Amino acid sequence: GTDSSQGIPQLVSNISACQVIAEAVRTTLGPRGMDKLIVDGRGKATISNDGATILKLLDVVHPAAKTLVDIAKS
Amino acid sequence: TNDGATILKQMQVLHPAARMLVELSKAQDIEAGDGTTSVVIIAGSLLDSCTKLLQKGIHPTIISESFQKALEKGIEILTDMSRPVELSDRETLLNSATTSLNSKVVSQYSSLLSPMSVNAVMKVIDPATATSVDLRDIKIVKKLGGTIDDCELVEGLVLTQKVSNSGITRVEKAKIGLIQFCLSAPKTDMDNQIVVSDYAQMDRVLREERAYILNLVKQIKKTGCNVLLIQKSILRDALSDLALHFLNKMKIMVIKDIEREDIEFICKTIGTKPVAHIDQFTADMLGSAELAEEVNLNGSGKLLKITGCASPGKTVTIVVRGSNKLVIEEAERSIHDALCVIRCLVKKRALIAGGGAPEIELALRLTEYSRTLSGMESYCVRAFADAMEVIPSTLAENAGLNPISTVTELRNRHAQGEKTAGINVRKGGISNILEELVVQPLLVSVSALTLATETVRSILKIDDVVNT
Amino acid sequence: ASLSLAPVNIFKAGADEERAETARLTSFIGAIAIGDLVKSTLGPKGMDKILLSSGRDASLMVTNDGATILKNIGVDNPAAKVLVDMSRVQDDEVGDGTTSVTVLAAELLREAESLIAKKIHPQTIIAGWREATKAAREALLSSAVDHGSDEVKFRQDLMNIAGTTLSSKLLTHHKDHFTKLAVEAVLRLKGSGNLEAIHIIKKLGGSLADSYLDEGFLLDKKIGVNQPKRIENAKILIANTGMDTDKIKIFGSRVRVDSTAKVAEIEHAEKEKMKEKVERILKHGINCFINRQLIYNYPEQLFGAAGVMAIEHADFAGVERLALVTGGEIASTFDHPELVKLGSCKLIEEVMIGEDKLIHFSGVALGEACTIVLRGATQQILDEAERSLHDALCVLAQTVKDSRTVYGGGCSEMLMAHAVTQLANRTPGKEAVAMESYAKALRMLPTIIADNAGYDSADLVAQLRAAHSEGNTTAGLDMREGTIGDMAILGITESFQVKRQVLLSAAEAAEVILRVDNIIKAAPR
Amino acid sequence: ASMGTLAFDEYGRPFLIIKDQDRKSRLMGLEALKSHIMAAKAVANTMRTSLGPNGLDKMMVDKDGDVTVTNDGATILSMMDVDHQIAKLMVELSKSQDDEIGDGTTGVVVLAGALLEEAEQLLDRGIHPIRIADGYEQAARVAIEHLDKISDSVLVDIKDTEPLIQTAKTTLGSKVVNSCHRQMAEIAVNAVLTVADMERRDVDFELIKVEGKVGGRLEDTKLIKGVIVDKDFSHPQMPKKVEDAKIAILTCPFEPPKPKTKHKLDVTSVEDYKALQKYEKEKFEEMIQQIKETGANLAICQWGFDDEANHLLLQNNLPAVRWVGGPEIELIAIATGGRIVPRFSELTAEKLGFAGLVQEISFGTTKDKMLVIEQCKNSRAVTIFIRGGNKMIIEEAKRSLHDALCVIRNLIRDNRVVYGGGAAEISCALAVSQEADKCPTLEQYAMRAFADALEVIPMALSENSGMNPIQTMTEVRARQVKEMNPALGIDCLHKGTNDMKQQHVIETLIGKKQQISLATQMVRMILKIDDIRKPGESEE
Amino acid sequence: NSGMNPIQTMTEVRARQVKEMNPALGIDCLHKGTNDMKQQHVIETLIGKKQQISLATQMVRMILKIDDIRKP
Ligand SMILES: Nc1ncnc2c1ncn2[C@@H]1O[C@H](COP(=O)(O)OP(=O)(O)O)[C@@H](O)[C@H]1O
Ligand SMILES: Nc1ncnc2c1ncn2[C@@H]1O[C@H](COP(=O)(O)OP(=O)(O)O)[C@@H](O)[C@H]1O
Ligand SMILES: Nc1ncnc2c1ncn2[C@@H]1O[C@H](COP(=O)(O)OP(=O)(O)O)[C@@H](O)[C@H]1O
Secondary structure, X not given: OOOOOOOHHHXXXXXXXXXXXXXXXXXXXXXXXXXXXXXXXXXXXXXXXXXXXXXXXXXXOOHHHHHHHHHXXX | OOOHHHHHHHOOOOOHHHHHHHHHHHHHHHHOOOOHHHXXXXXXXXXXXXXXXXXXXXXXXXXXXXXXXXHHHHHHHHHHHOEEOOOOOHHHHHHHHHHHHHOOOOOOOOOOOHHHHHHHHHHHOOOOOXXXXXXXXXXXXXXXXXXXXXXXXXXXEEEOOOOOOOOOOOOOOOOEEEOOOOEOOOOOOOOEXXXXXXXXXXXXXXXXXXXXXXXXXXXXHHHOOOEEEEEOOOOOOOEOHHHHHHHHHOOOEEEEEEOOHHHHHHHHHOOOOOOOOHHHOOOOOOOOEEEEEOOEOOOOOEOEEEEEEOOOOOOOEEEEOEOOHHHHHHHHHHHHHHHHHHHHHHOXXXXXEOOOHHHHHHHHHHHHHHHHOOOHHHHHHHHHHHHHOHHHHHHHOOOOOOXXXXXXXXXXXXHHOOOOEEEEOOOOEXXXXXXXXXXXXXXXXXXXXXXXXXXXXXHHOEEEEEEO | OOOOOOOOOOXXXXXXXXXXXXXXHHXXXXXXXXHHHHOOOOOOOOOEXXXXXXXXXXXXXXXXXXXXXXXXXXXXXXXXXXXXXXXXXXXXXXXXXXXXXXXXXXXXHHHHHHHHHOOOOHHHHHHHHHHHHHHXXXXXXXXXXXXXXXXXXXXXXXXXXXXXXXXXXXXXXXXHHHHHHHHHHHHOOOOXXXXXXXXXXXXXXXXXXXXXXXXXXXXXXXXXXXXXXXXXXOEEXXXXXXXXXXXXXXXXXXXXXXOHHHHHHHHHHHHHHHHHHHHHHHOOOOOEEEOOOOOOHHHHHHHHHHOOEEEOOOOHHHHHHHHHHHOOOEEOOOOOHHHOOOEEEXXXXXXXXXXXXXXXXXXXXXXXXXXXEOEEOOHHHHHHHHHHHHHHHHHHXXXXXXXXXXXXXXXXXXXXXXXXXXXXXXXXXXXXXXXXXXXXXXXXXXXXXXXXXXXXXXXXXXXXXHHHHHOXXXXXXXXXXXXXXXXXXXXXXXXXXXXXXXXXXXXXXXXXXXXXXXXXXXXXO | OOOOOOOOOOOOOOOOOOOOOOOOOOOEOHHHHHHHHHHHHHHHHHHHHHOOOOOOEEEEEOOOOOEEEEOOHHHHXXXXXXXXXXXXXXXXXXXXXXXXXXXXXXXXXXXHHHHHHHHHHHHHOOOOHHHHHHHHHHHHHHHHHHHHHOOEXXXXXXXXOHHHHHHHHHHHHOOHHHHHHHHHHHHHHHHHHHOOOOOOOOOOOOOOOEOOOOEOOHHHOEEEOEEEEOOOOOOOOOOOOEXXXXXXXXXXXXXXXXXXXXXXXXXXXXXXXHHHHHXXXXXXXXXXXXXXXXXXXXXXXXOOOOHHHHHHHHHHOOOEEOOOOHHHHHHHHHHHOOOOOOOHHHOOXXXXXXXXXXXXXXOOOOOOOEEEEEOOOOOOOOEEEOOEOOHHHHXXXXXXXXXXXXXXXXXXXXXXXXXXXXXXXXXXXXXHHHHHHOOOOOOHHHHHHHHHHHOHHHHHHHHHHOOOHHHHHHXXXXXHHHOOOOOEOOOOOOOOOOEOHHHOOOEEHHHHHHHHHHHHHHHHHHHOEOEOOOOOOOOO | OOOOOOHHHHXXXXXXXXXXXXXXXXXXXXXXXXXXXXXXXXXXXXXXXXXXXHHHHHHHHHHHOOOXXXXX
């Protein structure tokens, strides 16, 4: 939390977190999109071209990230 | 301390050469009993000759065989010059013992100790027709304070452990009894739990333990013993308060914490067999008694002196005194060196006057043999003789005297015929020391020469040292 | 490509890869380093070496055999580990030639480095070396001679081989007497190939000449107190019982008492059981009894009252060799006194040598065990002498198994070198160059063998080469004056099987090590 | 795309994007694919040198300090300090090829290396991976069709193994053991045919163990149709040689079993102590009589026995061993046909296996012997004994025999085989060139990329040996144009002829088609992955 | 500087010198066969070696007349 003060800077932080969480899934839209393989602890890296399947295995910690993932899950 | 055996065995440098020199000294002490300082000094001299022999670009293998030839020649010379004695010649034994005591702090305490040493040897081993001497026959009681005059020639047994039976002293005609069962409550080999649910049962517990210990005391007195000795037990209490009280009420001396190693010595000396079971309390424990006195050394040490037995073994004991531990050790090791000298007199009865005379003669003879030789062998034998010349230099030193003059005068006196010329410490000059009774056997100098030659050969063929 | 010059280093901390020539440089430099560390023990003038322990133990040992250095040394180069593995294999095969095979492998690797620097592929080198090894083996078997049928010639060859083994060691002063002693010791087994039966002792002090052979057995276990000290012509029984506070092996058993009277009753019951066991032991008709574990005060007192000696602290090796030499049978249940054979001995005594009490066995019945007395001033020379004696026993056993022998001391080495050189000049291609480098390493082995004496090399090597070209295949270098002459008349002979095994082991080790191209490393800990 | 993103907001305030971004090297996209492909570059170029008979051998020192010199690439790279997931994917590729076939595991890695070799230049030209992957899959189909076209099969069955012997010798030529190729081929085929199922079933490798001891000479490697037992007899005077022995399977110690649950027994009086002593003595008596009732020759104890049991067995003169491992018990029971015995309750002479011959083997002055079992009339287990000058040549022999037996198993699975040594590789390159000449233009770049990828096998074979690669390449290609033959390739052993068939080299076609398909699939997968996360904090 | 033995060389030299005296009974450095410098024409001025010995003796003595160092 850097410049996470009341007002606009915290909104800027949330927007940046949203951009970062989008970047991970930004490239898998469509039927001919690339797939993602990211280390997930014990090396059971999973191949999944579906963006939602990528979403269930992410490491979201920013509140903006969580409050976007919940909408995606719904 | 003075004698080098303990000095070498105490200090340590961790370098392999130092440790093997210490081992050489220990082996020399084992084989003969003295000359450890002489053999290590000889080794050092051979090595200072060796380094100069080595800077001259000489292979360190031909020098080994040259040293072997020098060793065999020196052994031949020493055997030739030595003169045999007789086992019945007490004068020669007294001379050897006195010479042995000279290199110790008790040098002037020799006229009373050399007959003491030879008499102790005669007592503890076969008077004649024997080959080996058991040094374990005689034990030593090292006591602080006192003087050499306070030393004794006791022939009984001394218990250094304190009298746990306080108030009991000087049991006249004491009958020594050794037991191994611990004086405490009975305990099974297996774990037991004394569960008590009634007052009567708990009362019966200690009532029965008291009855059993009283029965034990009664069966102990069945034979009629008056002195009790217990083993050194740490898992179980060797002596308990109840047993001590019951034995003090009816006058039995009690001493605990007795080592199990002395039991074999006691059996060899008198024969009181240890007892582990109460039912085997026979009548063979005891015997005739002569004296049992708790001597005190002006309050500087508590001892239990029990001397005098009927038909004992061939074992005696020595009580060595001295103001500080160092002089006590010096006197003890002087006595031990005298005993080892008598042992060396037992076998290979070939005596030669010492005091640098054998080393002067050996140096001269090896110089002659080197002159007769040729090649690198002659130079190696010359270095050998120059090295072995060190002992008369050290003896001539420690007094400020000239080593060069002493060595050349001794060599000239050997050349004119007087081979037995040595160093006279009392007169502070150079003359024959046969009158001074400075004589040593063959298998002390021979052993030192052989051991030093073997060690220098061992370290001679060495290339590198590596660690693991 | 190589990871040495790469944009990234795909490694953990401390793990690295180096260029192929650098990798072989490191591996073979470690191999040659261990090689010349084991070097300088070849020939009769081999200089000894101290095996020091860098840790707090500081255990100092001296040995002339390089295999002792090999078994106890830190490992840095993987090729050095391969070398110590193959050398240990050779040592377990035969007791001599271990340093020989190690130094041959080290050379083969160093001229392999030189030849690769001379722009030659490793596979070509391997092929040429295989051809040269085949030629050398065929030449060695061509000149191999067996003389086991002739008993006098067999004994003379045993003399020569034991003298050959002892020449490299410091025992050359008594070489002949120790040789006949060891040959008598190995023949005392009546053709038995085992060597653990022959047992040795150590006694500080005394001259090396004082060493001798004892036909019976030497024992160093103390005797009890109450039992009589010396009883002869007795029967010796070996037992595997604990013989100390014998208790019920059931774990769940426990004692629950309400008073000390039952405690004393249980104590008396245990004492009575121990007495019954002692009587059961005594029922066997035995006076000298041998046990492994401790003996407490009550059983030793009972034995003393019974006038029967009990010997404790007899380890597994000691009872093994005692049973081998006397025929005694190990027992664990003493309920059948007559169903276990008792040991038979002629004379038993407790001799006094040095400043210790040693029990000496004489007139052993079976005699299938040799006990050797060795005397030395220091423990270092003692262990060197015993190691040399054990190596002599090993090589004597190897000769006994097969008497095919060859003339060593550089002689058979010149045979192999001549054959390999002849084939190399016979054949074209870089394989000939590789196998000629093989041959020059073969020639340089006895070169340094003789140079360890500070002698000349080229003249003797050329003279022996010319003589064997004339057909003097029995000519070998004489260490006595650093000269040449008939190798057989010097009484120095080497077993053909040992030579063949050393040659094959060196060839295979060089082949397997040379095939390594690059070194890859995991994460060190 | 390094050390995070530099924005610092846009009105002058401090800005935070990702945790630990002060030194985080953020890797997505084309540069991430460059990173992965170049890591695979390093892996492939470091591994590829073990191809062909002239191919050298890599060594590795593991995290435990144990060396490993090896020629078979699967086990060469099986213990690598893989960090990026692409290397691990190649590791599972190698494992899949190895347990699928056994040989050619080097081929997939080198083929993928060259595929990526030209794929990275195609990416540098600005080509998105989808069309590259599609062209590569089309090319793989073309190569598989060529492989099917140039197939040739022979007899493989148990009755005739001379072609099997030639195939095994060819396979082991690449290994250092090629000195006695005929001897190892014969002993390996004897071992595999000692116990085998010919009805397209698996051969019990649990019962065929490749074990040996160091020492002796390489040619002494011989087949032992039986079981190897490491343990030895406990007693010195105990006999060492027993013939026509019967195996007494024992899974209980020679001591009275104890209750599992915690138990307490109250011994209070002298009578109780004596009663417990006599009960224990009679329990030993019952146990020893029960053991002797079966009358078996050899008794194998898993939990061993105590001194009293040892003496009782000595008096009974019944050979027995102690503390034997469970898997060894299973192996000996299967080989001898023995039955499970829980304890003395089910101990009888009718449940005993039979061992034909039992001996103690000595290897000179070692004081460590071993027990060999063979000559079993119904031996269901066969083992091969290998001698060597050191433990690592022993390990190399182990893996060489492993690979040879895997090749034999592949041959038994199907006779559909082809000719290796780059000749089939050159034919596949010709086919891919033809397809490039006869298929739409845009993907022809991927066509010729795949062709140059398949061209690396003769490349590596030639540069391993040392001949000029490209002149031989062109000459063999021209001759293959003159005559269609999967037996015109590199003469690695310098035999002087390019007729590969004349040199008796046979490899399974299934292996090669699986190699090509697996390599294409893995390359296609790696082409479509551009995401790896690293903290890159550069800790001190 | 070359490698021949020192001591057998010494022995042979003084054996020949006691058999006959000549100022040219020395070392055959280049294997001319004989230890006779006259045949090999090994010539040096007497004055040079005279002064060699003299200067060596005097300076060795005057170095022996020094036994003190006081480095600060
Ligand atoms: N009165 C004396 N005059 C001259 N020399 C003596 C006299 N008494 C003893 N020595 C010499 O002192 C030496 C002492 O040797 P040793 O007892 O071995 O020394 P250490 O006891 O230190 O080992 C003897 O070798 C002997 O020659
Ligand atoms: N009298 C001799 N003359 C020449 N060479 C010898 C002689 N005696 C032994 N050798 C050689 O010296 C080598 C040294 O043997 P040793 O050091 O005991 O073990 P290793 O053979 O492993 O080096 C022997 O292999 C032998 O071939
Ligand atoms: N005699 C030979 N000449 C030319 N090439 C060969 C020969 N033997 C095998 N090869 C080739 O070398 C390649 C490597 O085989 P090898 O190293 O034995 O196992 P892997 O195929 O698992 O690497 C094989 O694909 C084969 O085509």
